[PDB]
Amino acid sequence: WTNTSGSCKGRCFELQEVGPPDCRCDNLCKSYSSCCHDFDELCLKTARGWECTKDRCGEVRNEENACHCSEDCLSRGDCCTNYQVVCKGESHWVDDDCEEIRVPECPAGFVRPPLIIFSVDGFRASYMKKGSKVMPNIEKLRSCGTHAPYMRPVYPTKTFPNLYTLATGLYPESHGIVGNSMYDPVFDATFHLRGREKFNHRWWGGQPLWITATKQGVRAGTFFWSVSIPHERRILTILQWLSLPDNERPSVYAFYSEQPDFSGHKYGPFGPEMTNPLREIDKTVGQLMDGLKQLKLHRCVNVIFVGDHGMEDVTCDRTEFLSNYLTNVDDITLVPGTLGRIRPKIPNNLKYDPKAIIANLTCKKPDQHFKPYMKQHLPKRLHYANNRRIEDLHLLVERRWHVARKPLCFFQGDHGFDNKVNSMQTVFVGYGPTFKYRTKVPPFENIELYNVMCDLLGLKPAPNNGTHGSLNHLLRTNTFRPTLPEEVSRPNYPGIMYLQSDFDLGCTCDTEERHLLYGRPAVLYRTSYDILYHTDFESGYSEIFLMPLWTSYTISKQAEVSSIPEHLTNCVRPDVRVSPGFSQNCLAYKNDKQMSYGFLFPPYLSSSPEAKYDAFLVTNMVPMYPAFKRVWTYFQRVLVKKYASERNGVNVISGPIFDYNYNGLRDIEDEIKQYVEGSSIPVPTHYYSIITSCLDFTQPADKCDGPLSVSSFILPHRPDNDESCNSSEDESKWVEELMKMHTARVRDIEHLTGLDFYRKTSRSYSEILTLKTYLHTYE
Numbered sequence: 112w113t114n115t116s117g118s119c120k121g122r123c124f125e126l127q128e129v130g131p132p133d134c135r136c137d138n139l140c141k142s143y144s145s146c147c148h149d150f151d152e153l154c155l156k157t158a159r160g161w162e163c164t165k166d167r168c169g170e171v172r173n174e175e176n177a178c179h180c181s182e183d184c185l186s187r188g189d190c191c192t193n194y195q196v197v198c199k200g201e202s203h204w205v206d207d208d209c210e211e212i213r214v215p216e217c218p219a220g221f222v223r224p225p226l227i228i229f230s231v232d233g234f235r236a237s238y239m240k241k242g243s244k245v246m247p248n249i250e251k252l253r254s255c256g257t258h259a260p261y262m263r264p265v266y267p268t269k270t271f272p273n274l275y276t277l278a279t280g281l282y283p284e285s286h287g288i289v290g291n292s293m294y295d296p297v298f299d300a301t302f303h304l305r306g307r308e309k310f311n312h313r314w315w316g317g318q319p320l321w322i323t324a325t326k327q328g329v330r331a332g333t334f335f336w337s338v339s340i341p342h343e344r345r346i347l348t349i350l351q352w353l354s355l356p357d358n359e360r361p362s363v364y365a366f367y368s369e370q371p372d373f374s375g376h377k378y379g380p381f382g383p384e385m386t387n388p389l390r391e392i393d394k395t396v397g398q399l400m401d402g403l404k405q406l407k408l409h410r411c412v413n414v415i416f417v418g419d420h421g422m423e424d425v426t427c428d429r430t431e432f433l434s435n436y437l438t439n440v441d442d443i444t445l446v447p448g449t450l451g452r453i454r455p456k457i458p459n460n461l462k463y464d465p466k467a468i469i470a471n472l473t474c475k476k477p478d479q480h481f482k483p484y485m486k487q488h489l490p491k492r493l494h495y496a497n498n499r500r501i502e503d504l505h506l507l508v509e510r511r512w513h514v515a516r517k518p519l520c521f522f523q524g525d526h527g528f529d530n531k532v533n534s535m536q537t538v539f540v541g542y543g544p545t546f547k548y549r550t551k552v553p554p555f556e557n558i559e560l561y562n563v564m565c566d567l568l569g570l571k572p573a574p575n576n577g578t579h580g581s582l583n584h585l586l587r588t589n590t591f592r593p594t595l596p597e598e599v600s601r602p603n604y605p606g607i608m609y610l611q612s613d614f615d616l617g618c619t620c621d622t623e624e625r626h627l628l629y630g631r632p633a634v635l636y637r638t639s640y641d642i643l644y645h646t647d648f649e650s651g652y653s654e655i656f657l658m659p660l661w662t663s664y665t666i667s668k669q670a671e672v673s674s675i676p677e678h679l680t681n682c683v684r685p686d687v688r689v690s691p692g693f694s695q696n697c698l699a700y701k702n703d704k705q706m707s708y709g710f711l712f713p714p715y716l717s718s719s720p721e722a723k724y725d726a727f728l729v730t731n732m733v734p735m736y737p738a739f740k741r742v743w744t745y746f747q748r749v750l751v752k753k754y755a756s757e758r759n760g761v762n763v764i765s766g767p768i769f770d771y772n773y774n775g776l777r778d779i780e781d782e783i784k785q786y787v788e789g790s791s792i793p794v795p796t797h798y799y800s801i802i803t804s805c806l807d808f809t810q811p812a813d814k815c816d817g818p819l820s821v822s823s824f825i826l827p828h829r830p831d832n833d834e835s836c837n838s839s840e841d842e843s844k845w846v847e848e849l850m851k852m853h854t855a856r857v858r859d860i861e862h863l864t865g866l867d868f869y870r871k872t873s874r875s876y877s878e879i880l881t882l883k884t885y886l887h888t889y890e
């Protein structure tokens with residue numbers, strides 16, 4: 112029971128923690144029906160609106176007014192934000208020239224620059240192009256501070272997963288808010304964006320910034336605002352908190368606006384009706400900045416202007432219905448719209464038939480505007496599988512479309528799609544003493560921001576998925592000095608210890624400086640492996656997994672592609688430096704009716720026939736389904752050379768990935784669940800390739816003076832090409848399309864392999880971290 116007879120007098124929006132029996136006077140009080148009886152009366156005044164007018168200057172204070180224009184308002188901290196402009200002849204902040212802020216200029220008693228996070232819902236990155244004609248305050252923040260052209264949200268590109276990712280630095284699969292709506296089979300309970308279940312703490316994992324701050328003795332303002340509280344009151348409240356005594360004042364603040372998302376849904380992102388909401392948000396930013404100027408804080412505070420996701424054109428006329436594909440959709444529950452998650456209507460309904468459902472949803476219409484995936488087959492870059500709240504069956508929906516269960520307008524916009532889709536990208540601007548001045552930075556992922564906010568606050572971040580230091584380039588100071596991980600396993604460099612006669616493998620056959628331009632990868636786990644040198648490639652061959660952890664080679668732009676001769680079609684040779692016992696055997700391949708093999712270094716790119724025979728080495732071989740071979744051969748034979756030509760040479764590192772439990776992390780031996788028939792040769796779930804060149808394409812890759820350029824992939828190792836609806840055609844019609852979908856960051860590959868790349872370069876470690884987080888999106 113909470114005793115609501117208490118009073119909020121002297122208590123409005125108090126930061127003090129207040130539990131029942133006591134009644135409350137904060138933002139959460141309504142959700143808990145715990146407000147004091149006079150909360151709305153005392154704490155939510157609205158009289159006279161939010162702006163001083165000339166006729167109010169030097170009024171006697173009426174405590175019934177929403178804000179004040181009396182002479183004493185400044186000392187008390189409750190002036191309307193435009194008081195000085197109207198009453199004292201000052202200028203709005205937006206009308207002042209931009210001046211670099213080289214160090215914080217903070218009033219007496221401020222020990223560090225406060226951080227204010229200004230989040231806007233559904234703010235598409237491209238809205239920024241509207242510029243000062245529509246958003247003069249925001250344009251000033253953007254042009255004078257540090258901005259990215261866009262910031263990449265997490266999937267699904269909806270509000271709750273993204274706001275909580277901003278707060279935690281975690282992927283949804285890790286923080287647990289995997290959708291605006293979700294079912295947890297262990298709780299047997301359902302979470303919705305609207306309603307009370309979401310208030311239960313059991314849903315929310317990781318450690319959000321406000322808790323990190325609090326635990327480390329840094330005080331936070333609210334990070335939740337009741338929907339009933341107007342934006343003007345949110346801003347006034349923040350400004351009032353900033354006026355508090357040194358011993359009460361928070362260091363970090365959050366503002367949230369539900370616009371322009373609401374209007375985007377109603378009118379679509381390109382609607383003329385979007386101008387007004389955008390003007391309104393700008394006016395709010397203006398109130399904040401004017402208010403800060405009144406407090407002499409406008410050159411003291413760090414401000415982050417950040418969105419949760421973008422907005423796409425989606426109308427009623429573009430809806431796929433599952434009832435067109437499946438016979439009884441009333442027996443399933445679909446989380447619908449811009450994504451699909453399917454489970455039986457009755458939890459654990461035993462007659463649920465997922466393989467039959469997937470088969471009926473696979474490439475059944477030529478223009479089909481979604482694609483079904485078991486979650487472990489989703490592109491690894493989405494990091495969307497390792498959580499019990501994520502249904503096994505997922506539908507990745509085409510941009511501009513919806514998926515609905517059945518047929519049984521008012522909306523022209525929506526979001527939720529694949530987070531590399533352009534329309535889903537959102538905004539980032541940082542302005543203030545700790546950010547750079549008039550600086551543009553490359554796009555980056557929202558998972559990175561938690562570390563930076565911790566930096567801006569002097570906090571040590573909880574473990575998260577950001578790569579700390581990858582955003583140091585946004586900052587004038589307070590950068591984090593990263594340190595290189597220590598290698599855990601040093602390699603063996605084995606010479607010949609055997610003879611061809613030594614092997615009974617079933618086969619028949621009738622540098623470091625040049626091929627590892629950025630140094631050899633460090634192995635960050637305990638294992639046993641051999642460095643193997645060759646004319647055309649180097650590898651780290653694992654004695655445990657019976658194949659390379661990595662194969663590294665450089666291909667000049669002028670490099671010549673050769674065919675493989677018909678007599679060498681099935682040539683596999685023993686490797687005299689590696690024991691027969693630590694080798695794969697071709698008998699297993701001849702014997703497995705479903706699994707073939709491929710090579711990490713492609714024979715096609717041999718320097719010479721003598722060298723080409725090295726490519727057929729048993730230690731360059733890896734297990735590949737014929738379906739995958741269609742992809743890999745096209746990549747090895749055609750694409751690698753094409754990249755070399757377009758990029759002026761490339762350095763390639765390729766290898767296997769084992770992630771049977773789909774947690775995005777290197778499997779231990781125990782976790783591997785498939786082997787070549789009759790053998791102990793483990794089967795990769797994916798194959799990766801990291802392709803690097805000189806950012807300045809005029810320089811060849813091996814002669815690169817400056818920054819690097821990288822693209823990487825994590826290709827799923829599957830027994831069929833059902834994912835590619837056009838795979839019956841020549842590889843030139845579908846393989847690249849598949850590869851683009853499975854683009855990846857180097858950092859993703861690092862998690863999955865336990866390797867550390869780019870350890871020997873002429874660039875800073877921070878620059879390299881940025882490179883490792885880069886994602887080539889093909890948008």
Ligand SMILES: *[C@@H]1O[C@H](CO)[C@@H](O[C@@H]2O[C@H](CO)[C@@H](O[C@@H]3O[C@H](CO[C@H]4O[C@H](CO)[C@@H](O)[C@H](O[C@H]5O[C@H](CO)[C@@H](O)[C@H](O)[C@@H]5O[C@H]5O[C@H](CO)[C@@H](O)[C@H](O)[C@@H]5O)[C@@H]4O)[C@@H](O)[C@H](O)[C@@H]3O)[C@H](O)[C@H]2NC(C)=O)[C@H](O)[C@H]1NC(C)=O
Binds near residue numbers: 284317497498499
């Ligand atoms: C992104 O970054 C995160 C954060 O570093 C990484 O996630 C971590 O992975 C490691 C290694 O697998 C896990 O270590 C294990 O920890 C558990 C004990 O963990 C419990 O206590 C910790 C610490 O307080 C807590 O964080 C954990 O929270 C998990 O479980 C909660 C209760 O169910 C849940 O509410 C919360 O959301 C989180 O669930 C997620 O992780 C679990 C696995 O723990 C997973 O089953 C679930 O689906 C979610 O993904 C938990 O109470 C020990 O038993 C082990 O010995 C081992 O030490 C961390 O627990 C895990 N941390 C978090 C917060 O997820 C990711 O790997 C990284 N991803 C990538 C791709 O790099």
Ligand SMILES: CC/C=C\C/C=C\C/C=C\C/C=C/C/C=C/C/C=C\CCC(=O)OC[C@@H](O)COP(=O)(O)O
Binds near residue numbers: 230304335
């Ligand atoms: C709810 C997220 C929980 C915690 C994360 C909090 C903060 C994250 C970091 C920085 C900025 C601060 C944000 C604080 C947010 C406060 C208000 C929180 C939720 C309001 C939710 C809301 O109003 O959603 C509106 C819906 O139209 C979204 O529906 P969709 O359009 O379908 O996604």
Ligand SMILES: *[C@@H]1O[C@H](CO)[C@@H](O[C@@H]2O[C@H](CO)[C@@H](O)[C@H](O)[C@H]2NC(C)=O)[C@H](O)[C@H]1NC(C)=O
Binds near residue numbers: 114115116117
């Ligand atoms: C709920 O709150 C009211 C307000 O504080 C409490 O009312 C006071 O209670 C004591 C009774 O011993 C009186 O002396 C005061 O006159 C009351 N104050 C007012 C302004 O009403 C009430 O006690 C609380 N209910 C509880 C504790 O169950």
Ligand SMILES: *[C@@H]1O[C@H](CO)[C@@H](O[C@@H]2O[C@H](CO)[C@@H](O)[C@H](O)[C@H]2NC(C)=O)[C@H](O)[C@H]1NC(C)=O
Binds near residue numbers: 436438
């Ligand atoms: C998958 O689609 C096929 C239709 O292509 C469905 O087959 C129908 O099933 C009903 C009863 O099961 C038969 O009486 C109809 O004759 C079939 N339709 C056609 C056009 O042949 C099948 O039911 C679907 N499977 C699922 C799981 O929805």
Ligand SMILES: [Ca+2]
Binds near residue numbers: 776777
């Ligand atoms: Ca794994």
Ligand SMILES: [K+]
Binds near residue numbers: 700702703705
């Ligand atoms: K075979």
Ligand code: NA
Binds near residue numbers: 474833837838
């Ligand atoms: Na196919």
Ligand SMILES: [Zn+2]
Binds near residue numbers: 269
């Ligand atoms: Zn949103």
Ligand SMILES: [Zn+2]
Binds near residue numbers: 233373376526
């Ligand atoms: Zn929305």
